[PDB]
A paper describes a structure:
Here, by deleting the branch-site adenosine (BS-A) or mutating the branch-site sequence of an actin pre-[name], we stall the assembly of spliceosomes in extracts from the yeast [name] directly before the A complex is formed. Our structure indicates that the U2–BS helix has formed in this pre-A complex, but is not yet clamped by the HEAT domain of the Hsh155 protein (Hsh155HEAT), which exhibits an open conformation. Thus, [name] proofreads the branch site indirectly, hindering spliceosome assembly if branch-site mutations prevent the remodelling of Hsh155HEAT.
Further classification and multibody refinement improved the resolution of the stable U1 snRNP region and adjacent U2 5′ region to 4.1 Å and 8.3 Å, respectively. The U1 snRNP structure in the pre-A complex is highly similar to that observed in the yeast E, A and pre-B complexes, indicating that U1 does not undergo substantial remodelling during early spliceosome assembly. As in the aforementioned complexes, base pairing between the 5′-splice site and the [name] is also stabilized by Yhc1 and Luc7 in the pre-A complex. Second, U1 snRNP rotates by roughly 45° during the transition from the pre-A to the A complex, such that Prp39 now interacts with Lea1. A prerequisite for U1 movement is the dissociation of Prp40 from Rse1, and thus the apparent dissolution of U1–U2 bridge 1.
Author numbering:
A (entry chain d): 3 to 95
B (entry chain h): 1 to 49, 58 to 73, 78 to 119
C (entry chain b): 2 to 63, 73 to 131
D (entry chain C): 3 to 197
E (entry chain i): 8 to 80, 83 to 108
F (entry chain H): 4 to 19, 38 to 140, 172 to 244
RNA sequence: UGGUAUGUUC
RNA sequence: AUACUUACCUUAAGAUAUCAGAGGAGAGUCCUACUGAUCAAACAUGCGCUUCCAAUAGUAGAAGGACGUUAAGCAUUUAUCAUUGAACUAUAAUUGUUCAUUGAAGUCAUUGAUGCAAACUCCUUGGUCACACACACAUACGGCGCGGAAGGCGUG
RNA sequence: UUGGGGCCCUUUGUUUCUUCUGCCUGGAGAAGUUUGACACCAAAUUCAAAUUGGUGUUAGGGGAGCUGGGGCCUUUCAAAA
RNA sequence: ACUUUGCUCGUUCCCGUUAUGGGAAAAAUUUUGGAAGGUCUUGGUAGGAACGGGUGGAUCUUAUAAUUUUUGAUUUAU
């Protein structure tokens, strides 16, 4: 259905992440609320245009197809989404 | 009637692939996804006579020492421009389309 | 690089390998994969992104090449703007040690299910 | 369908309004915070030692090393090393949690204390403080604390508190010293201090 | 008619009916009368070849490919004869059939 | 749907005289009660009449400058009156259930046993016994401590703070029912 | 035929 | 932990490898602890197979780096436009030269950026293993030790 | 059981399976081990203490018995020259 | 191909006889498959088999060749 990477992107909500866009502009800020379509909203945004300059947005909202990548913090190195043999405690009928 | 199932019958076939960037990849096929994400081994890839982005993509894969010899490359579907099959393979027997034959028999 | 990547392996078998994944730009990401999906969205542990400058490209056109490396750490890369992925370096622990670790994870998961069944009673 | 890996709870068909409300509730917060704390504690506490490589040492190194001296090994009992390592763990966590807060209490009567140090009238991150108040939908969380708020507004000017010494200040804290090396303090002061 | 509400497992019959009596009349005529067609691609790679198979994605198998492109610096034409080819429908600009 | 293109095709197919029974008049005027209770626990099921956006835009363009239709307004008034009567019957049933819970058999027996022992010094003893009976009544009422919502007919609480109450007022049921009460009061002010 | 979250009393 | 109120929601389907033959069920479909063949997975197992596994008869060195130093190393290149005033080269929205009033944004960086090149130091990895400090080879090298890591092929 | 010689003790919590005692004039002793036990984190109950939710560990080597598979030799049956 | 009659060569044994025939085994020996024993080496030693699912996770097909990856505006050219 959804998959592991979109669940990991929805996992790190409310944390300082860093995006890079397809044009080359790198954003960095606190993730407000991520979605399954990766259309992600950031706050306290610092932006670097592909020309080179640095600016600051207050509340950005980027579409998921114009994202090169996004960096989650390192404590999500150890996540239960990464566990291969985690069993399921009795799903409901 | 997707012809990716035609490429699924092409295991251990020694082919070339021209990509959309311009790189020619000579290697044997191992497997291919139904989304045409094809893996290859015993690979040499070459950017012919330019595109500096393609030269960067050619060199920055490890194993350059402009023919680059690599052991294992997975290739995404949308980067495949065309794939050239060996002429010794018979296309009349590999394109039998047994799924299409079962669909015609089910009609 | 004398690694001898497996001849009949796929993305479920290439997990926890130090990949060297190529993109459309050529911005090569080096790091361990830990997950994928249908769109080939790859998470990358201890990842580094390497490029070549425009001045180095003239020397690269037909020796030493000074690549520009930035450190990303644990990132999550999309499958749209990527081109190809290879296996660069083998992981630390071996296949038998990963097998013993997977058996320990299975026994720990079965013990956790027995603990949930004991707490449910 | 949706399954929380943290809380080990299932759900109905995947609604964004239900999944958003699941990551706000207090049980998911407790389980998630405890899981992150325990995984960080495990990856700190895991002493991944190097695999030892012992080679057949040289002859003259053996005649030099076995004749210089023989050192003495110190070692302790089980309860002693357990108590010492527990004190070292609480010292490491209290050093990881602490921070120097001298500039906040040292510029307390400054005329721009209500514009930078108040941390609510701050410009760049003050909207983040004013946004999530944790609005305390429980009545007991609002009825528990009965002390003053002492919320310093931005509009406080220099006309208020003109003389900082008449309005009773606090004497500054002394430079704290290590308790394990507290026996080497000069016991005689330079000047006579009363009270 | 909406695509999701037609039927189940009978969409292949409608796809074959669109193949016989739709825009696919030229790819069908080339594979049954073995006439050579000229496919112009998105990077000036003009292909003169015969069609072997049809796909929903216009993935076409071509036999006895004579391809030609033009390098503009000065102006040269470079050609290549390729025996077997599997062309993706992403690269295809246009397909011309000769009588 | 799993693809958004089929969702957009559905929006186009449902977006593209006028006095016909197929057009929902409560939705043609606005705020149909079968629309304001679609997926909640107080759902009526599915509206038998069809809803359309082009007819709603034509009705808005007609009511902007052209004219107004009193028959659809009277039908919406009758539907709102029937739904308000059903909700008032539900609120009266909830008030009767609250009065039956406040007048249970064992609770009235305990209250009568406390009041039978409730009878200067005698006045102070009677005041202390009345305070003890009031404390027992407060402990009996605090076992549930459920009030009655004056508008939507739900259950509320007095010791609950204003934030959980504000979370209660921002629901689909309460917003829809306050809008239906505003429409009913506007139609009763226009008719009378 | 149900699930998630929250607030009171024992 | 029990009891109750409230807020949101209540589900895209079909299937689990392929081919040939025989039998059964009222041209088409289903089943066979039915038979032959291909393929996949798991467990064992062997191929004088393919690659690698760091001195100790010393104070070293192989692979990958430093987001380390010398190093502000050496050689180059840039660091805003317009109106007007006192002269002005002048096809421009006076571009060029010296000085200034004013007008819109106005990356920090010039100890900056690119290229070139050497030395030093420090990090992660290993069989730092068992015998010996030894005279072999045109069919070029007795690959006929105990293993480990990666892979190929073959068998059950 | 004692004594001698060589190496290692980074095992850095001085063996790291756990607990307790204990150690460089030594390298040890006692108990337990998967519906259990051990260690730790977080909290409101106003010291300590107790309760609840989770995390991680329960190991390595050798030997008797049983079983699966690989290679060699021997005995017997069926088939082909 | 069956069948008979005698000659010649011949694996082994017997007999008429060591020329040569008669009879028997129609054999000693090589390979394959199956049954048993001995020796060398390796793995495992507490879970396994059957059935049931308004079971969970993976794989294929169609929605889905149209703005969210995967059926293209990244070889910088008029």
């Amino acid at each position: 259905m959804n998959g592991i990477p979109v669940k990991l992107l929805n996992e790190a909500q409310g944390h300082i992440v860093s995006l890079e866009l397809t044009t080359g502009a790198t954003y960095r800020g606190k993730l407000v609320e991520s979605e399954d379509s990766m259309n992600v909203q950031l706050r306290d945004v610092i932006a670097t245009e592909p020309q080179g300059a640095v600016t600051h947005m207050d509340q950005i909202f980027v579409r998921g197809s114009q994202i090169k990548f996004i960096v989650v913090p390192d404590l999500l190195k150890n996540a239960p989404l990464f566990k291969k043999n985690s069993s399921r405690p009795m799903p409901p009928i | 009637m997707k012809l990716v199932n035609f490429l699924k019958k092409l295991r251990n076939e020694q082919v070339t692939i021209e990509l959309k960037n311009g790189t020619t990849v000579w290697g044997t096929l191992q497997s291919v996804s139904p989304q045409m994400n094809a893996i290859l081994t015993d690979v040499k890839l070459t950017l012919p006579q330019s595109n500096g982005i393609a030269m960067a993509s050619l060199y920055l894969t490890g194993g350059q020492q402009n023919i680059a010899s690599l052991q294992y490359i997975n290739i995404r579907g949308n980067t495949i421009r065309q794939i050239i099959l060996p002429d010794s393979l018979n296309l009349d027997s590999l394109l039998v389309d047994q799924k299409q034959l079962n669909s015609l028999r089910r009609s | 690089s004398k690694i001898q990547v497996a001849h009949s392996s796929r993305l479920a078998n290439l997990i926890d390998y130090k990949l060297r994944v190529l993109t459309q730009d050529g911005r090569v990401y080096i790091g361990q994969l830990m997950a994928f999906d249908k769109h080939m969205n790859l998470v990358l542990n201890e990842c580094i992104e390497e490029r070549v400058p425009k001045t180095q490209l003239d020397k690269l056109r037909p020796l030493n090449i000074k690549v520009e490396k930035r450190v990303l750490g644990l990132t999550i890369l999309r499958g749209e703007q990527i081109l190809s992925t290879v296996v660069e370096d083998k992981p630390l622990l071996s296949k038998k040690e990963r097998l013993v670790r997977d058996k320990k994870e299975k026994k720990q998961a079965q013990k956790q299910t027995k603990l949930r069944k004991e707490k449910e009673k | 369908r949706y399954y929380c890996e943290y809380c080990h709870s299932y759900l109905t068909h995947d609604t964004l309004s239900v999944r958003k409300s699941h990551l706000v509730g207090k049980n998911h917060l407790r389980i998630t915070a405890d899981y992150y704390r325990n995984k960080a504690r495990d990856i700190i506490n895991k002493h991944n030692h190097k695999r030892r490589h012992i080679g057949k040492r040289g002859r003259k190194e053996r005649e030099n090393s076995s004749q210089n001296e023989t050192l003495k090994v110190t070692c302790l009992s089980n309860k002693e090393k357990r108590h010492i390592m527990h004190v070292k763990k609480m010292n490491q966590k209290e050093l990881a949690q602490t921070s120097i807060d001298t500039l906040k209490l040292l510029y307390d009567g400054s005329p721009g204390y209500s514009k930078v140090f108040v941390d609510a009238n701050r410009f760049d991150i003050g909207d983040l403080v004013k946004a999530s108040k944790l609005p305390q939908r429980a009545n007991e969380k609002s009825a528990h604390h009965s002390f003053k708020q002492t919320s310093r507004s931005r509009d406080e000017t220099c006309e208020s508190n003109p003389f900082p010494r008449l309005n009773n200040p606090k004497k500054l804290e002394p430079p704290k010293i290590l308790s394990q090396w507290s026996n080497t303090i000069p016991k005689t002061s330079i000047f006579y201090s009363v009270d | 008619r909406p695509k999701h509400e037609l039927s189940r497992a009978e969409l292949e019959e409608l796809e074959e009916f669109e193949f016989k009596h739709g825009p696919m009349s030229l790819i069908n005529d080339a594979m049954v009368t073995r006439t050579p067609v000229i496919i112009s691609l998105r990077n000036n790679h003009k292909i003169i070849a015969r069609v072997k198979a049809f796909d929903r994605h216009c993935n076409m198998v071509l036999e006895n490919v004579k391809e030609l492109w033009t390098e503009k610096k000065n102006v040269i034409n470079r050609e290549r004869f390729i025996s077997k080819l599997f062309l993706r429908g992403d690269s295809v600009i246009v397909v011309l059939k000769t009588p | 749907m799993s693809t958004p293109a089929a969702e957009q095709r559905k929006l186009v197919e449902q977006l593209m005289g006028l006095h016909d029974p197929k057009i929902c008049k409560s939705y043609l005027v606005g705020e149909c009660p079968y629309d304001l209770f679609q997926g909640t626990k107080q759902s009526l099921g599915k509206c038998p009449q069809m809803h359309l956006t082009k007819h709603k835009i034509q009705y808005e363009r007609e009511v902007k400058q052209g004219k107004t239709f009193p028959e659809f307004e009277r039908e919406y008034l009758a539907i709102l009156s029937r739904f308000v009567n059903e909700c008032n019957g539900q609120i009266s049933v909830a008030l009767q259930n609250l009065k039956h819970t406040a007048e249970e058999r064992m609770k009235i027996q305990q209250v009568t046993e406390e009041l039978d022992v409730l009878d200067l010094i005698s006045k102070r003893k009677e005041v202390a016994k009345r305070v003890r009976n009031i404390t027992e009544n407060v402990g009996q009422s605090a076992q549930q401590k459920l009030q009655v919502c004056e508008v939507c007919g739900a259950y509320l609480s007095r010791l609950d703070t204003d934030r959980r109450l504000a979370d209660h007022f921002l629901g689909k049921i309460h917003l829809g029912y306050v809008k239906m009460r505003e429409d009913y009061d506007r139609l009763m002010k226009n008719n009378r």
